[PDB]
Short mmCIF file of C-alpha atoms and ligand atoms in Angstrom, two decimals:
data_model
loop_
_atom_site.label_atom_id
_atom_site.label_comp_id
_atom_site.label_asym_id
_atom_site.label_seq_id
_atom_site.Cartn_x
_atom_site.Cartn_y
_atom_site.Cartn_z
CA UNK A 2 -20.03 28.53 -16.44
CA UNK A 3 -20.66 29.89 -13.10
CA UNK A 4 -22.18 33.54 -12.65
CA UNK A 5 -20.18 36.49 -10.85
CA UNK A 6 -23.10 35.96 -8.08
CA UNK A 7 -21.71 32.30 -7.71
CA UNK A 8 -18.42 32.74 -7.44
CA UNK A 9 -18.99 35.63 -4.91
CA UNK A 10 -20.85 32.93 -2.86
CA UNK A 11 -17.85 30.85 -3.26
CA UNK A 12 -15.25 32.66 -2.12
CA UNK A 13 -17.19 34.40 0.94
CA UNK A 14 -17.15 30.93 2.36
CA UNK A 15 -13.13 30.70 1.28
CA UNK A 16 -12.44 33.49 2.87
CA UNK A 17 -13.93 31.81 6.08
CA UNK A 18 -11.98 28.57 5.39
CA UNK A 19 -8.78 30.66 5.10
CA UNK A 20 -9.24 31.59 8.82
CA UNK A 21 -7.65 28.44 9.37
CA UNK A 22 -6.70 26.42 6.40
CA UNK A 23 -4.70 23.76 8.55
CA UNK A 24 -8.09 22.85 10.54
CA UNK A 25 -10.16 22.84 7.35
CA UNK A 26 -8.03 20.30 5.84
CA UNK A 27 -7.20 18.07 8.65
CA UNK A 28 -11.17 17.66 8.70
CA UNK A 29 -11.66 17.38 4.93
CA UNK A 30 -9.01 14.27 4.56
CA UNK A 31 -10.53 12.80 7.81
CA UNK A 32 -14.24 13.16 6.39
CA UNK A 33 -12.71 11.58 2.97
CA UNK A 34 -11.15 8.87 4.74
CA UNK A 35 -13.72 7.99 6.64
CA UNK A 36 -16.40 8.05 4.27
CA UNK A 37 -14.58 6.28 1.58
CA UNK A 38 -11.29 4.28 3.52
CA UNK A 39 -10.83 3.27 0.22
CA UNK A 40 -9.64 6.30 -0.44
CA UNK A 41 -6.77 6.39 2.22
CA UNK A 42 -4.78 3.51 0.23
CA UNK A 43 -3.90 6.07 -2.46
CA UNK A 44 -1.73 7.61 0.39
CA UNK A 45 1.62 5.41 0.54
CA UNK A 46 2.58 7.95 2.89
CA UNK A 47 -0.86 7.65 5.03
CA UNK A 48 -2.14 4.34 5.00
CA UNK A 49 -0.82 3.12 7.86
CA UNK A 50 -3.10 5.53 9.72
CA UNK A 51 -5.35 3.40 12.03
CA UNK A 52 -8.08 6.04 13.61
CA UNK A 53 -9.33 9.45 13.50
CA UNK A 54 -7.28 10.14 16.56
CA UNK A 55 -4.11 8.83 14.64
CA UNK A 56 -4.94 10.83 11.61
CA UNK A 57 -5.89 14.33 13.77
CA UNK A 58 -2.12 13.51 15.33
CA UNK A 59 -0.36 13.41 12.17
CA UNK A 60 1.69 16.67 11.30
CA UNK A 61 2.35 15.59 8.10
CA UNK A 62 -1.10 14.85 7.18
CA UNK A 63 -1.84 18.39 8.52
CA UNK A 64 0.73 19.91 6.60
CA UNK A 65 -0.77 18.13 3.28
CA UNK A 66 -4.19 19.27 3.87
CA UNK A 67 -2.83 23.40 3.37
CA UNK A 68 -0.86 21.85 0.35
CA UNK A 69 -4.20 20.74 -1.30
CA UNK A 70 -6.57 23.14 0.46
CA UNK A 71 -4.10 26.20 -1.06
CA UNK A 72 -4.14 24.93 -4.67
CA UNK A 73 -7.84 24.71 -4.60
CA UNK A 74 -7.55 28.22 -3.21
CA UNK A 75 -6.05 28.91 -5.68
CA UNK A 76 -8.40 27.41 -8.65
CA UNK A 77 -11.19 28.56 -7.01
CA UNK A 78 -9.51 32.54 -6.68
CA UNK A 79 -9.02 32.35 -11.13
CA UNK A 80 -12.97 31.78 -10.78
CA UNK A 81 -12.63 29.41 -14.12
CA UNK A 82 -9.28 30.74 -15.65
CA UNK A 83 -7.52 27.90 -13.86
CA UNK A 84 -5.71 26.27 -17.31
CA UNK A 85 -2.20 27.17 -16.00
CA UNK A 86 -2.94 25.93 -12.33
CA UNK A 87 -4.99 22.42 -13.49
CA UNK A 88 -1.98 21.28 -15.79
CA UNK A 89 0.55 19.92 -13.64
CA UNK A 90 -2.21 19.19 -10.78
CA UNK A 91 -4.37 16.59 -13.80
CA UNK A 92 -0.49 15.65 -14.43
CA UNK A 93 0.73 14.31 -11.52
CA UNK A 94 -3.07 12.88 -10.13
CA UNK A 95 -3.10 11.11 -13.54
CA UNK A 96 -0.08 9.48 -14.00
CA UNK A 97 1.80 9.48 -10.62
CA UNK A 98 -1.29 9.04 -8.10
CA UNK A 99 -3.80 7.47 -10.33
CA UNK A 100 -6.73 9.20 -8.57
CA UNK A 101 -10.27 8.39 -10.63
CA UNK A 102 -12.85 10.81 -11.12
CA UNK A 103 -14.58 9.14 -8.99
CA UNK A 104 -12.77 10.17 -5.87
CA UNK A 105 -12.36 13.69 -7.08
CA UNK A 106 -16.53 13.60 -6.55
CA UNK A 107 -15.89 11.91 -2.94
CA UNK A 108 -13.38 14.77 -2.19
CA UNK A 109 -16.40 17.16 -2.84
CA UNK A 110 -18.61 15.19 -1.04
CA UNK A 111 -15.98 15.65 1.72
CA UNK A 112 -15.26 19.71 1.31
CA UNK A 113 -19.00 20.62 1.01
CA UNK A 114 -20.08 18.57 4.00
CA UNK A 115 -17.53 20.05 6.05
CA UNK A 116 -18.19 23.43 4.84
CA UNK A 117 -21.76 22.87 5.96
CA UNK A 118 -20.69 22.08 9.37
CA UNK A 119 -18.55 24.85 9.73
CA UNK A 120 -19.89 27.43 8.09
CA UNK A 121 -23.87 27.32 8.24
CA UNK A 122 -23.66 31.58 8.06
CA UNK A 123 -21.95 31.14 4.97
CA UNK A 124 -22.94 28.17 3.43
CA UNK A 125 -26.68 27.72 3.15
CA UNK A 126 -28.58 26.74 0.22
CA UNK A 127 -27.25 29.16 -2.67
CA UNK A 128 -23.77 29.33 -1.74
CA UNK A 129 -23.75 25.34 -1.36
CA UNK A 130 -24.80 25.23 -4.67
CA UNK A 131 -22.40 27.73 -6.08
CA UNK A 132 -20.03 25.68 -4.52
CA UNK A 133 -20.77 22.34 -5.76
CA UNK A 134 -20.94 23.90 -9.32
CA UNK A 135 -17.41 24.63 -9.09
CA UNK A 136 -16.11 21.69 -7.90
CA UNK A 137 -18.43 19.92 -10.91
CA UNK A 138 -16.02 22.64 -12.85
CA UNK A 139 -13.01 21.78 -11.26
CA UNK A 140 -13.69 18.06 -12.19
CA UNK A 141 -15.07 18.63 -15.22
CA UNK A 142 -12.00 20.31 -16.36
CA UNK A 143 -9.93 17.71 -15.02
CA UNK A 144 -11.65 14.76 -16.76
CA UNK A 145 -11.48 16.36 -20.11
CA UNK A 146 -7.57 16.94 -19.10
CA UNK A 147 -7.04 13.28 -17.84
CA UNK A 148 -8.38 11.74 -21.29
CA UNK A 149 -5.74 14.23 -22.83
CA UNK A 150 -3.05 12.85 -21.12
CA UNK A 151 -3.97 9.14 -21.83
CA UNK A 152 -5.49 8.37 -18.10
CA UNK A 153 -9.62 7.05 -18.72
CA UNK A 154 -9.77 8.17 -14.46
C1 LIG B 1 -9.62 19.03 -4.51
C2 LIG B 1 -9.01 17.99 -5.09
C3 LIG B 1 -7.53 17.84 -4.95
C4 LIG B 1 -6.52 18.76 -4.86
C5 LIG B 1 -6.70 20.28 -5.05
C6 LIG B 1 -5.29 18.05 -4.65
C7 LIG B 1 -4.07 18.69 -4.53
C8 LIG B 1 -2.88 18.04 -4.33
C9 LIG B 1 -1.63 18.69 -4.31
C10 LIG B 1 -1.37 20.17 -4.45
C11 LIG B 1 -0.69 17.73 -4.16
C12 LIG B 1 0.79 18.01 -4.06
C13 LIG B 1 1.39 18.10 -5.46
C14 LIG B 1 1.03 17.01 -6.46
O1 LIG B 1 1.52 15.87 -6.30
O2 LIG B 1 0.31 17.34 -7.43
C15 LIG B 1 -1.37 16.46 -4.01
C16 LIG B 1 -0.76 15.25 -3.82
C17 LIG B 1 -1.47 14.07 -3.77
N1 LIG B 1 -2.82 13.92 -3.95
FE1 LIG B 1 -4.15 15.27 -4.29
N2 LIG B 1 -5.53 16.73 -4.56
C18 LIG B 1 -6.86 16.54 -4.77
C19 LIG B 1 -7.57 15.35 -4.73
C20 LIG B 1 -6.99 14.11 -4.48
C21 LIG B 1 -7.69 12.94 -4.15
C22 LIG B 1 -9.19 12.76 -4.17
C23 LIG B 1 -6.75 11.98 -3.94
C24 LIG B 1 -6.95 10.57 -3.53
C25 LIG B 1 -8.07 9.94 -3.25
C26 LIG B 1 -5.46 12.58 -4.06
C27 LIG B 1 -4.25 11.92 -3.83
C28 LIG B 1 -3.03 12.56 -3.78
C29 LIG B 1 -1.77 11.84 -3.48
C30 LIG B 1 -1.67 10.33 -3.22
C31 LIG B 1 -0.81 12.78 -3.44
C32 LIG B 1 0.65 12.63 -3.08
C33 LIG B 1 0.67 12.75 -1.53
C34 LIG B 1 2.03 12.67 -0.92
O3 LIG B 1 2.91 13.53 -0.98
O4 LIG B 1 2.35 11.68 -0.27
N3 LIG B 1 -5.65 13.93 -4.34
N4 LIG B 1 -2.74 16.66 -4.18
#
């Protein structure tokens, strides 16, 4: 359970992200794909991308990174009342995308290390850490949902 404290910490760096959610998550997916290409082949719309330059071109990878940075917006805004909004998001990652628990931690790796680039007046030691605890949240909350809907993830 994360303090009022944290979650102040959290969204004072949101509120910097929402500046320009588009940019945020154009480098997020690019961090995650290039960290982890392994990744990318979840994406039958995206894995044909080649480069970084191809994937920074892509309007349609753009437009997904607002999708998925504005439902974590979202989450992160209920600070840990998120039942309604994790439902049909543990749904369809389950049993449509088949997305592992394991690359819900490398999509953290990939949010907090570009948070840290971006954002060093908002995202030192403290507020990293609030952050990370809500993403181990956000997952944990997601693993216990995944087991209920039959996926092991
Ligand atoms: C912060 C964690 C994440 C959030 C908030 C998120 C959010 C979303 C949202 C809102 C959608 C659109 C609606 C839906 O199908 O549910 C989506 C689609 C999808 N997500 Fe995620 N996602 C997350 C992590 C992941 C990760 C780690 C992967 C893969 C490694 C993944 C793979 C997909 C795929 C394959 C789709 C369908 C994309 C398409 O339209 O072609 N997601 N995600």
């Amino acid at each position: 359970v994360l303090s009022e404290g944290e979650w102040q910490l959290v969204l004072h760096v949101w509120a910097k992200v929402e500046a320009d959610v588009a940019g945020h998550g154009q480098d997020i997916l690019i961090r995650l794909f290039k960290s982890h290409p392994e990744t990318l082949e979840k994406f039958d719309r995206f894995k044909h991308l080649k480069t970084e330059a191809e994937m920074k071109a892509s309007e349609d990878l753009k437009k997904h990174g607002v999708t998925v940075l504005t439902a974590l917006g979202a989450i992160l805004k209920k600070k840990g009342h998120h039942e309604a909004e994790l439902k049909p998001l543990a749904q369809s990652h389950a049993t449509k995308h088949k997305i592992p628990i394991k690359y819900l931690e490398f999509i953290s790796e990939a949010i907090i290390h570009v948070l840290h680039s971006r954002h060093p007046g908002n995202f030192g030691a403290d507020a990293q850490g609030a952050m990370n605890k809500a993403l181990e949240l956000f997952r944990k909350d997601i693993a216990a949902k995944y087991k209920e809907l039959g996926y092991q993830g």
